[PDB]
Design a protein around this nucleic acid. Structure first.
Ligand SMILES: Nc1ncnc2c1ncn2[C@@H]1O[C@H](COP(=O)(O)OP(=O)(O)O)[C@@H](O)[C@H]1O
Ligand SMILES: [Mg+2]
Lengths: 246, 688, 16, 49, 49
RNA sequence: GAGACUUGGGCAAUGUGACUGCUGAUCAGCAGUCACAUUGCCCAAGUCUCUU
């Protein structure tokens, strides 16, 4: 009864749950008092984090040979980053089945999902987006451990992970996955310097002072927090540099 | 200060008697009773110097509120030569471990602070009752019900019954509330709660005459006719407000925590909607009680409060709600200012025009108040005048402060002699009228009052008692006197010579107020006669009634290591533990209670289930106490909740979540437990 | 009432 | 009906009024015995004696 | 025991002035319950006679 | 049985006076916890530049 139309989730995900209890525990956000029969999803995401990171690291170690470890660690960190997990969870329409309730968290999820719909459910490679919901990537990563425990086989879990990550794998393997921010600082002519950002309510800003095409330009960007305001400034600096390059 | 402080004729005998036996002092405010308390502290300092284990001790001075604790801390520090430790809840002693508690205990000779901190640190085995020399209580009349003073006193009953620390209580009022009836039983309950005998002034001519330097103020009163007709614009504003209420309840925000009755009997509006409706209803009461000009003053405060709340409103829907409230308040402000300016056409003398507008649109009570101020201050010097006014509502304070601002700007005689200022209780409201932090400021309104910056203060019972204020000469009370304690404490403030006590009441309420004033005077007198003639007993050595005072509640449970758990603190401990679990905003940590049903009551319990009620506790899914816990069957829902929380926290302690010292465990305890298991090889390398 | 009726201009403080 | 009866005295003729006298062995009915003077006051003024 | 004996006469007389069978059956059931209670209580009485 | 009176009994209606608990709403006063924000002390840690 908790899992309304769970067959839709299974069909989209591609796996079948012989026991549905693991799915309920994985979908049980801590803010959901009506579920007295299973625990929260923290005790599953704890294992799922290790499962995901080890599996993907082993895959890239075996396959992506022609690159140094100094960038292989960056690739694995990008592929395990919570933002990519949130994007993947958005792609598979898993927001529907999250047995969660909250005032502001639900608003954040709605804003993120409509933003991703605007982007076409593709990674914005890093996002100038308002704010990313951590719990979304958390529940997506936890359902991986839920899938594994339902079968106790690594091979099936890896098939599921690969089926979920095929576009991300093919993208990050070809193009440089991410460095960002730092490459702006170390850029050939871009020498960004910044002031201290201040948050207020649900708005934030930072004065970005950088250089571009041998000139000096100041840019601003929408965001949520101090460091993510600096992130928005970095995103718009990257946009200006790319457009000037283009 | 210095040693020029010379004890009076009554302080010496008071401290001499208090040395022999425990007792409570009862002297009028400003009679230097804290000074004789200091002298008492100067007779129990023998064990201050030596450390705890070597045989040395300390002393605990007690207070109810933070500010009074701090003020008396500076007082004792400047009056003595001891290392006075000052600690409160906000000071940061919450996370203090054993070592950085022990250092403070061993680096001080006397401790001061609030009730909760001292009570908790006594219950957390940091010190023992046997490890104390003398304990000093002030405003001892607070010691009733579940108040922390009585809870701390119960530790005297549960702990050792030999070489027990002294207890002394400081007060000037003995009764809290409208229970003036049967003063003798209240006095006896106060006697037994602090296991002492009240000692009071006795030798009339030599000593009460000297003590009466805290002179009794002269008291007067003024009556005014009732205003009965209601203005036409008021009902229009009420109609707009009620349709706004209908829209607000109709409009839809996301899921919000369910707030219900304090007895869980039925539902309530969501906290934000209840809050905004409380604002609007309070402003409406302001309008009817004080007219239109005062309403015009208060609507600006509502505007600024709504703007601040919308600014801090995280969710967009809450921002829309506050925006709609702001639009309605702006419309109300437009109508009010139009009505106020509707009369200003005829006259064109700006100062006199504003003065007569204030007089014209005001309620008769406020008109009488302002004319009384004009005829009392009488255009005198601004330095000598230092007057107080008491009003009941918080927003009434700010509104009347604005009204006095405008009126003082409207009279040349008062424009140079009065400097109004207001302050309220802990739920402080911004004194601004334009925007949040219009300017950064560093002086409290009380301090400005003390330095002569503000000769007139507006305040609720927040400035009634405790906080030291110079001898006032004029005190005014607008809203009706509510209790005995506030009346007597207010009349004690007007300490200077020929001080004036002033209060106001309506025409049809004067006769009622006669009984309250005469009853309060009789209640002050009969205490004097009865204590003057009480039975000469030593220290209330009736241990049978001492243990028969508290037994009717749930017996407090103590484990090994000497830690003791108070059943009345079970709710606080449970909620504090719940807050430890990390969560997002709406992720609730508070345990959602549930009252049982009689059919379910005897479905789970015996025949006694029908007679008395039971409440059930549920826990958030993150807490490992997944299984629900059913409270013991108690009579009322209050004791049911107390028993439920006590049993639940006992189960938590048994499971080890609650530590030995009865506090939730951080990661420090976890890593300490794991260290000698998983990280033993660090020690052979000299680390850990 | 349009205008609140004015209280007595002359008034003194009665003693309880 | 005691003070109900005696309220007739004000509305009816206040002069050439029959003598009224109160007879009792107790004065206070209920647990409001506190401040006996003020409670005896309305007894005095209700019975115009 | 005396109380349950007393209840019998009041229940019976109430049934006597009872108007229709709907309350007659109610009083009859009440009397049967009262008599069963009385019998149980007198068994309790005689247990230690 | 009725008409009326005498006394009593039965039922009902409604009102009055008092008491014990139980909650409701509003308002003031007090304590504690958690979190966020401001900048700084600030070491860890990686990157990068200079350079050590
Ligand atoms: N015998 C005395 N010696 C020295 N100072 C005194 C004496 N009596 C009164 N005082 C001073 O008068 C002041 C009275 O204020 P306080 O004692 O705080 O009033 P209360 O104790 O009633 O609240 C004290 O600050 C105290 O220093
Ligand atoms: Mg004092």
């Amino acid at each position: 009864g908790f899992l309304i139309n769970h067959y839709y989730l299974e069909k989209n995900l591609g796996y079948t749950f012989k026991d549905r209890r693991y799915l309920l525990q994985a979908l049980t956000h801590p803010s959901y008092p009506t579920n007295r029969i299973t625990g929260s999803y923290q005790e599953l995401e704890f294992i799922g984090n290790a499962i995901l990171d080890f599996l993907i690291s082993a895959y890239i170690f075996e396959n992506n040979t022609k690159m140094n470890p100094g960038a292989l660690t960056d690739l694995r960190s990008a592929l395990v980053n919570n933002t990519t997990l949130a994007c993947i969870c958005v792609r598979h329409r898993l927001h529907f089945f999250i047995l969660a309730e909250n005032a502001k968290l639900s608003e954040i999820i709605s804003k993120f999902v409509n933003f991703q719909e605007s982007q076409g459910h593709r990674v914005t490679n890093m996002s100038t987006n308002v704010d990313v919901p951590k719990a979304l990537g958390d529940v997506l990563e936890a359902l991986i451990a839920a899938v594994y425990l339902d079968c106790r086989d690594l091979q099936r879990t890896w098939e599921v992970i690969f089926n979920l990550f095929e576009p991300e794998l093919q993208e990050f393997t070809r193009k440089v996955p991410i460095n960002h921010i730092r490459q702006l600082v170390e850029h050939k002519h871009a020498k960004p310097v910044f002031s201290s950002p201040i948050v207020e309510g649900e708005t934030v800003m930072v004065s970005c002072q950088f250089t571009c095409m041998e000139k000096t330009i100041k840019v601003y960007g929408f965001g949520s927090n101090k460091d993510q305001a600096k992130l928005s400034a970095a995103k718009h600096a990257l946009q200006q540099l790319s457009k000037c390059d283009a | 200060e210095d040693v020029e402080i010379k004890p009076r004729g009554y302080q010496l005998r008071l401290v001499d008697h208090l040395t022999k036996s425990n007792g409570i002092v009862y002297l009028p405010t400003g009679s230097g009773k804290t000074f004789v308390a200091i002298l008492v502290l100067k007779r129990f300092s023998q064990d201050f110097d030596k450390p705890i284990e070597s045989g040395g001790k300390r002393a605990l001075f007690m207070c109810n509120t933070v500010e009074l604790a701090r003020q008396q801390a500076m007082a004792v520090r400047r009056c003595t030569n001891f290392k006075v430790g000052f600690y409160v809840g906000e000071q940061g002693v919450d996370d203090w471990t054993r070592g950085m508690w022990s250092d403070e205990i061993k680096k001080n000779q006397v401790l001061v602070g609030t009730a909760q901190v001292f009570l908790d640190m006594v219950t957390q085995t940091y010190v023992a009752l046997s490890s104390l020399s003398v304990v000093i209580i002030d405003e001892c009349h607070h010691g009733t019900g579940h108040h922390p003073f009585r809870e701390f006193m119960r530790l005297f009953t549960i702990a050792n019954q030999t070489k027990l620390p002294r207890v002394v209580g400081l007060t000037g009022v003995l009764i809290k509330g409208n229970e003036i009836t049967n003063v003798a039983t209240k006095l006896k309950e106060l006697e037994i709660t602090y296991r002492g005998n009240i000692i009071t002034v006795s030798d009339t001519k030599e000593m009460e005459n000297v003590m009466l330097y805290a002179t009794k103020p002269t008291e007067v009163m003024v009556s005014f006719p009732h205003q009965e007709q209601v203005l036409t614009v008021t009902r229009l504003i009420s109609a707009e407000i009620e349709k706004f209420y209908v829209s607000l309840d109709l409009m839809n925000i996301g899921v919000q925590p369910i707030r219900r009755s304090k007895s869980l009997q039925c539902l309530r509006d969501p906290s934000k909607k209840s809050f905004v409706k409380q604002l609007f209803n309070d402003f409406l009461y302001q309008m009817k009680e004080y007219g239109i000009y005062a309403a015009s003053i208060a609507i600006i405060s509502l505007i600024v409060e709504f703007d601040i709340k919308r600014r801090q409103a995280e969710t967009l829907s809450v921002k829309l709600m506050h925006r709609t409230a702001l639009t309605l308040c702006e419309k109300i402000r437009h109508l009010l200012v139009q009505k106020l300016q509707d009369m200003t056409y005829d006259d064109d003398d700006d100062n006199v025009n504003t003065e007569e507008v204030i007089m014209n649109f005001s309620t008769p009570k406020v008109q009488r108040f302002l004319m009384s101020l004009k005829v009392s201050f009488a255009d005198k010097d601004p330095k000598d005048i230092c007057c107080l006014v008491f009003v009941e509502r918080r927003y009434t304070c700010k509104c009347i402060y604005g009204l006095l601002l405008n009126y003082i700007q409207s009279t040349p005689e008062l424009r140079n002699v009065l400097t109004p200022q207001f302050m309220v209780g802990r739920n402080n409201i911004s004194p601004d009228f334009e925007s949040v932090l219009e300017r950064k400021w560093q002086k409290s309104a009380i301090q400005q009052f003390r330095d002569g910056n503000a000769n007139l203060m507006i305040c609720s019972s927040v400035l009634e008692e405790g906080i030291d204020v110079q001898a006032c000469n004029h005190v005014f009370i607008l809203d009706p006197v509510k209790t005995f304690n506030m009346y007597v404490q207010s009349k004690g403030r007007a300490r200077t010579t020929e001080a004036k006590f002033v209060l106001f009441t309506a025409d049809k309420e004067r006769e009622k107020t006669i009984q309250q004033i005469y009853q309060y005077r009789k209640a002050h007198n009969d205490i004097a006669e009865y204590l003057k003639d009480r039975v000469l007993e030593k220290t209330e050595p009736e241990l049978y009634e001492i243990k028969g005072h508290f037994q009717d509640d749930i017996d407090p449970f103590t484990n090994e290591n000497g830690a003791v758990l108070l059943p009345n603190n079970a709710l606080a401990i449970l909620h504090r533990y719940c807050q430890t679990i990390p969560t997002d905003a709406f992720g609730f940590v508070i345990p959602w209670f549930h009252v049982l049903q009689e059919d379910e009551r005897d479905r789970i319990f015996g025949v006694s289930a029908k007679g008395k009620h039971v409440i059930s506790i549920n826990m958030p899914v993150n807490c490992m106490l997944r299984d629900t816990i059913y409270s013991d069957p108690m009579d009322n829902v209050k004791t049911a909740k107390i028993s439920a929380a006590f049993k639940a926290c006992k189960v938590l302690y048994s499971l080890g979540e609650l530590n030995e010292r009865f506090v939730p465990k951080t990661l420090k305890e976890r890593v300490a437990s794991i260290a000698d298991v998983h990280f033993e090889h660090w020690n052979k390398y000299g680390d850990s | 009432i349009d205008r609140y009726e004015q209280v007595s201009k002359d008034f003194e403080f009665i003693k309880i």
